[PDB]
């Protein structure tokens, strides 16, 4: 039949771009071709308009079977031709070794790391279902999509997956389809030697419909019903068990060696044999199933046409809803939103970050109704929570409504980085958060780095950020944590000093299309600074303090900035004359011109650094860095501060001890290098 | 009762130590005091013996209930007083927020970061599985012990838990007993808003068995019959549902508020009076609580007693076995164990440092019987596993026997991070170790952290350190893994060039008795290097190649070692002499004589250092550097290096550049510092 056709073409394919690189993964390809033939049948998508808002969207976990996903895209006629897999994991191709979404037409998110996709099919079905709730009308469905993903073993034993998955229990998210390549083979063997937990009854306790297909490697009539049948379960996210042979049809099939080396020629020769295939021929892409498959994307492009004619009959029965919806589609945010960031002079009491962050979020919520978000069970300690919100619940519960725009995540930090990527992905123009201490941002690490990679403007909102949250002492007080995400490509690390700061950092964060941001937030209260504004803290460094005579210049970060101003009044005693720069976000610093740059830190100075934290990183803007690297302590925050010389007087001796080192030196900027 | 009135002198102890300090969790001591009083009273435990090898040990993994931990403690006789609980929280003193296993006596890890303990258990109870199959005899149980676990629903929440208890299952840990404190309150109000699945369902698909209680604020008898059922049960781990009352008698029981923060004044005094208490007392203890608890430790003391002679008994009947112990138990590694550690020569093949990590393996872990690893599915990759050994696994299986030595993690890094700090907790000289990429110790990194902070010495095996891995991609690549790693307090993390550093690292990993190792180790050949040895390359850095009339020093680390000396052949032909440094371990290194440094890192030439990673920490040692600051790409790996111009011409340049760029200026070493 041309479906069996279609599913070889697809095998062979995938087989063919590993045979090509000398790299990658045959097995789930060759195990999964016929499940990847029967979803994508069932989906609606346009290869010619990847951003429909209404797509059926999919999410291939197990991205090492990459290969799969680039055959179904290049049949279906996305941007990507037979010549791109030929080019499957060379240099510059766009069919790298793992999908990602910066790169590759039709890949929704960037997987590879294993248990990442599940939840950001999570995300995606979280953000329909939101979605639909804010624009749905009677007689007019304008968001109705699915979230199909594939994972495999490895994706369960992740423990991102099991918080991902008690979570999508819990929110009842029927659009989400799920399928386990139950094919009992891993790296290191059988699954037996390791993953022997009853997988099904875990989903079902965790509150998902099952449907199990016994012989996956033919039986898409069975496949196609289960999906049908976890179209009617509306108030679970359902878990399809395909049980797959990995390698079908190789000589190898059923064991780990066809995991994740090509095959052997004499074994591809056979495989086109069986399948009617010229064992001579590589890349055969018969000119039936290209029909059969064009017939499928007519139709979704139909369906999509429809929808524009649904979409502009919306804006005249709901015009306040249809603009709102229109400009979210256009990627633009409200016109002059950011007018209702609170502004602070120094006259302004002392506030903790952590409460000024509140402040915001309740200010720009209403004004900006894709901003979602929530946090880690921290809600009433990272004050994530505008006050008159409802939480996004299934309306069942009646704890919350899907209209809602603040999330309970529970414990689970991980799995809310990979669902904000999810939100992120399915587009809409979602700004959507996140909160947990910062220590514990570390968790979610693996997520945290794809939000990087994948260019998603998430925020995290990152509590009590240093020893100055005090009693809890070592275990939750970060180090190591600024200079980790620091150093990763691509993150705009912010701790803001102040109200001004902090607002700053929000209209970052916002306004953000391609970089995620954390903010790193204080448990304790701050001052307001005389000489900050939204203005100077948009450049993400900036002159607080100038003096022309300067001696020495201090650059500090959050709480510190405060302190280093402080001691420029202890330092001015000693007959030493400091500037003050505060440098809330280093990356939003680097991308300033080289000439403001050098304004905020000249040559001809000694510039000492001061963050309670790591000093790696602040030799790019610094000569010598006062900082924390050893662990906290248990105890009430200034004793802790007093403990490590935190304090004006210390600030203030190693500030002299700068000016000594260099007497008779000559000082250029740390912003200079050799290439 | 004398029972009862030890369950609230438990109780009145954690609520008073919250009271003084004004901070702190009373809400699960509360709840749990009962349970508390009934474990304690089946563990055998000698309160001046800590390290006794057969005692039960405890864990506390919802560790912010510490001062329900340091009740007992304290109430038991160890090295920790009532005089301490008055200084919960406080600066300096013996009873910090969250407990921590360097400063509290009593206390196996250290907890707080949600999840972690309930996966130290699963390592204490692994060890102690290893432990008894490698040393037990007829009519000698040397080792008998169990694991006691405490835990609430946010380490339920945590993906890193499920992992744990998934592997747990499989594993068959009978003599691994937890407790979930199930009181339906966590920091963001009723778990209904956030924590809706059946607990109990999952973990009987993980194949644990299941004790309900359910009335555990007050029945200590079916407490007590719930740990022999579990004891009854050989082949499966038990979770205990204790339902319970979070904060049970106060006004505010059955509360978020009570979780987290102190009691109100008059609420102590009703809590006082309904148990037969002074209200106008703090601290109480009252002689009989203190006669019962004597009476159980004079009981463990006799048993401990008969536990010595057993084990002078045994070392009689197996005099090998017996001495091998005692030399365990004594901290000590076999006399010269490290003459087995592999040499090379420069005349030797060129070999990827995973395989040189491989061969070090075959060779000690014959030699040194305490060495037990795994991987996190990744044993073919990682190189991880000696031929001829055993895999660690119930003999129920067929696949492995509990005397084996090689553990098949899955693709659960965090929790193998966590059991792998469980393993050292154990004691018994373990030296354990655990592989998986470099990219992916990043979802561990709660656990890792804490390895630090807990001054275990674990070791990762880290392979496929960089883009030299080639075609797997960016989200495989590591850029800002060793910037995290390097930038925690008390991480070794080892990036060996050759084979002689390849030993070297080993052995400093196996030595270590209070520092985590994280070995970072090539996919990719690298040659053998001219004045490598053990040696040198155990002072974490070394000069490689001296040049007494250096223009510049190159420092470089693992495969970039070998392009520096490539390079510095290349400078000959530009003029420029150029001396080499190899840097295996900062922190080693680091911990070398200010003498010792200078030699390798002396004033008066410039120094550039090399690694194709983030630049973060590298001003440490250098005066420029050459690094990778953005991510990596899908492609034959020497294509990359030439891509981001990582070659001995790209080096060279930068090299030539940097000799420009100080031609005039006067160069101090990068190790001196103003303060
Ligand atoms: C977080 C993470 N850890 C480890 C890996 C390494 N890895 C890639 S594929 C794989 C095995 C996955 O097994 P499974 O999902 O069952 O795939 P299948 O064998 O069916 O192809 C592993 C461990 C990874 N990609 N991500
Ligand atoms: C990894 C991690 N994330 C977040 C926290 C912050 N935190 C401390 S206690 C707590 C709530 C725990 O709830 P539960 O375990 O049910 O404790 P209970 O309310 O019963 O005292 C949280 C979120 C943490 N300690 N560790
Ligand atoms: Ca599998
Ligand atoms: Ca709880």
Same mark, same amino acid.
């Given at each position: 039949?041309?479906?069996?056709?279609?599913? *070889?073409?697809?095998?062979?394919?995938?087989?063919?771009?590993?045979?090509?690189?000398?790299?990658?993964?045959?097995?789930?390809?060759?195990?999964?071709?016929?499940?990847?033939?029967?979803?994508?049948?069932?989906?609606?998508?346009?290869?010619?308009? !990847?951003?429909?808002?209404?797509?059926?969207?999919?999410?291939?976990?197990?991205?090492?079977?990459?290969?799969?996903?680039?055959?179904?895209?290049?049949?279906?006629?996305?941007?990507?031709?037979?010549?791109?897999?030929?080019?499957?994991?060379?240099?510059?191709?766009?069919?790298?070794?793992?999908?990602?979404?910066?790169?590759?037409?039709?890949? &929704?998110?960037?997987?590879?790391?294993?248990?990442?996709?599940?939840?950001?099919?999570?995300?995606?079905?979280?953000?329909?279902?939101?979605?639909?709730?804010?624009?749905?009308?009677?007689?007019?469905?304008? *968001?109705?999509?699915?979230?199909?993903?594939?994972?495999?073993?490895?994706?369960?034993?992740?423990?991102?997956?099991? &918080?991902?998955?008690?979570?999508?229990?819990?929110?009842?998210?029927?659009?989400?389809?799920?399928?386990?390549?139950?094919?009992?083979?891993?790296?290191?063997?059988?699954?037996?030697?390791?993953?022997? &937990?009853?997988?099904?009854?875990?989903?079902?306790?965790?509150?998902?419909?099952?449907?199990?297909?016994?012989?996956?490697?033919?039986?898409?009539?069975?496949?196609?019903?289960?999906?049908?049948?976890?179209?009617?379960?509306?108030?679970?996210?359902?878990?399809?068990?395909?049980?797959?042979?990995?390698?079908?049809?190789?000589?190898?099939?059923? $064991?780990?060696?066809?995991?994740?080396?090509?095959?052997?020629?004499?074994?591809?020769?056979?495989?086109?044999?069986?399948?009617?295939?010229?064992?001579?021929?590589?890349?055969?892409?018969?000119?039936?199933?290209?029909?059969?498959?064009?017939?499928?994307?007519?139709?979704?492009?139909?369906?999509?046409?429809?929808?524009?004619?649904?979409?502009?009959?919306?804006?005249?029965?709901?015009?306040?809803?249809?603009?709102?919806?229109?400009?979210?589609?256009?990627?633009?945010?409200?016109?002059?939103?950011?007018?209702?960031?609170?502004?602070?002079?120094?006259?302004?009491?002392?506030?903790?970050?952590?409460?000024?962050?509140?402040?915001?979020?309740?200010?720009?919520?209403?004004?900006?109704?894709?901003?979602?978000?929530? *946090?880690?069970?921290?809600?009433?300690?990272?004050?994530?929570?505008?006050?008159?919100?409802?939480?996004?619940?299934?309306?069942?519960?009646?704890?919350?409504?899907?209209?809602?725009?603040?999330?309970?995540?529970?414990?689970?930090?991980?799995?809310?980085?990979?669902?904000?990527?999810?939100?992120?992905?399915?587009?809409?123009?979602?700004?959507?958060?996140?909160?947990? +201490?910062?220590?514990?941002?570390?968790?979610?690490?693996?997520?945290?780095?794809?939000?990087?990679?994948? &260019?998603?403007?998430?925020?995290?909102?990152?509590?009590?950020?240093?020893?100055?949250?005090?009693?809890?002492?070592?275990?939750?007080?970060?180090?190591?944590?600024?200079?980790?995400? =620091?150093?990763?490509?691509?993150?705009?690390?912010? =701790?803001?000093?102040?109200?001004?700061?902090?607002?700053?950092?929000?209209?970052?964060?916002?306004?953000? $299309?391609? $970089?995620?941001?954390?903010?790193?937030?204080?448990?304790?209260?701050?001052?307001?600074?005389?000489?900050?504004?939204?203005?100077?803290?948009?450049?993400?460094?900036?002159?607080?303090?100038?003096?022309?005579?300067?001696?020495?210049?201090?650059?500090? $970060?959050?709480?510190?900035?405060?302190?280093?101003?402080?001691?420029?009044?202890?330092?001015?005693?000693?007959?030493?004359?400091?500037?003050?720069?505060?440098?809330?976000?280093?990356? !939003?610093?680097?991308?300033?011109?080289?000439?403001?740059?050098?304004?905020?830190?000249?040559?001809?100075?000694?510039?000492?650094?001061?963050?309670?934290?790591?000093?790696?990183?602040?030799?790019?803007?610094?000569?010598?860095?006062?900082?924390?690297?050893?662990?906290?302590?248990?105890?009430?925050?200034?004793?802790? +501060?007093?403990? +490590?010389?935190?304090?004006?007087?210390?600030?203030?001796?190693?500030?002299?001890?700068?000016?000594?080192?260099?007497?008779?030196?000559?000082?250029?900027?740390?912003? =200079?290098?050799?290439?």
């Amino acid at each position: 039949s041309v479906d069996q056709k279609a599913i *070889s073409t697809i095998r062979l394919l995938a087989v063919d771009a590993v045979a090509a690189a000398n790299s990658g993964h045959p097995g789930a390809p060759l195990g999964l071709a016929p499940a990847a033939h029967a979803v994508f049948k069932k989906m609606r998508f346009n290869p010619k308009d !990847t951003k429909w808002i209404n797509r059926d969207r999919f999410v291939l976990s197990n991205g090492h079977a990459c290969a799969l996903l680039y055959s179904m895209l290049v049949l279906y006629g996305y941007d990507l031709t037979v010549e791109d897999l030929k080019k499957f994991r060379q240099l510059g191709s766009k069919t790298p070794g793992h999908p990602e979404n910066t790169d590759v037409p039709g890949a &929704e998110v960037t997987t590879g790391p294993l248990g990442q996709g599940i939840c950001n099919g999570v995300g995606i079905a979280l953000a329909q279902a939101q979605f639909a709730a804010t624009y749905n009308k009677p007689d007019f469905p304008i *968001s109705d999509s699915y979230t199909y993903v594939f994972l495999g073993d490895g994706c369960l034993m992740e423990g991102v997956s099991s &918080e991902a998955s008690s979570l999508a229990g819990h929110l009842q998210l029927g659009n989400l389809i799920a399928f386990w390549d139950d094919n009992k083979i891993s790296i290191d063997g059988s699954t037996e030697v390791a993953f022997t &937990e009853d997988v099904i009854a875990r989903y079902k306790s965790y509150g998902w419909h099952i449907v199990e297909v016994s012989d996956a490697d033919t039986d898409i009539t069975a496949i196609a019903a289960a999906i049908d049948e976890a179209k009617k379960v509306t108030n679970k996210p359902t878990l399809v068990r395909l049980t797959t042979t990995i390698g079908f049809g190789s000589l190898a099939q059923g $064991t780990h060696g066809v995991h994740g080396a090509p095959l052997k020629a004499d074994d591809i020769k056979q495989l086109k044999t069986k399948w009617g295939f010229n064992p001579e021929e590589s890349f055969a892409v018969p000119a039936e199933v290209t029909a059969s498959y064009n017939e499928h994307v007519a139709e979704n492009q139909k369906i999509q046409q429809q929808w524009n004619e649904l979409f502009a009959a919306y804006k005249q029965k709901y015009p306040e809803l249809g603009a709102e919806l229109q400009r979210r589609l256009d990627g633009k945010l409200p016109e002059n939103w950011d007018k209702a960031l609170p502004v602070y002079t120094p006259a302004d009491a002392a506030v903790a970050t952590r409460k000024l962050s509140e402040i915001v979020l309740s200010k720009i919520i209403p004004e900006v109704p894709e901003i979602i978000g929530g *946090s880690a069970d921290l809600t009433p300690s990272n004050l994530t929570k505008a006050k008159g919100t409802v939480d996004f619940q299934p309306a069942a519960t009646g704890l919350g409504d899907y209209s809602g725009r603040y999330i309970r995540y529970g414990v689970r930090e991980h799995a809310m980085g990979a669902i904000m990527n999810g939100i992120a992905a399915f587009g809409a123009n979602y700004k959507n958060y996140g909160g947990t +201490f910062l220590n514990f941002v570390s968790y979610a690490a693996g997520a945290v780095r794809l939000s990087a990679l994948s &260019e998603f403007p998430i925020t995290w909102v990152a509590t009590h950020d240093s020893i100055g949250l005090g009693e809890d002492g070592p275990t939750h007080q970060p180090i190591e944590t600024l200079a980790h995400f =620091r150093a990763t490509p691509n993150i705009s690390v912010w =701790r803001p000093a102040d109200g001004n700061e902090t607002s700053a950092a929000y209209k970052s964060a916002i306004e953000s $299309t391609h $970089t995620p941001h954390i903010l790193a937030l204080t448990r304790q209260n701050l001052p307001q600074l005389e000489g900050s504004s939204i203005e100077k803290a948009s450049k993400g460094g900036y002159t607080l303090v100038q003096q022309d005579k300067a001696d020495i210049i201090i650059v500090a $970060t959050g709480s510190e900035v405060s302190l280093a101003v402080d001691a420029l009044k202890v330092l001015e005693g000693q007959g030493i004359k400091a500037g003050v720069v505060s440098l809330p976000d280093q990356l !939003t610093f680097d991308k300033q011109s080289e000439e403001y740059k050098l304004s905020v830190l000249p040559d001809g100075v000694p510039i000492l650094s001061v963050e309670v934290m790591s000093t790696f990183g602040w030799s790019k803007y610094s000569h010598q860095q006062f900082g924390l690297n050893r662990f906290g302590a248990s105890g009430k925050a200034p004793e802790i +501060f007093k403990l +490590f010389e935190f304090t004006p007087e210390g600030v203030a001796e190693r500030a002299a001890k700068t000016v000594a080192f260099y007497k008779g030196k000559d000082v250029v900027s740390p912003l =200079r290098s050799a290439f």
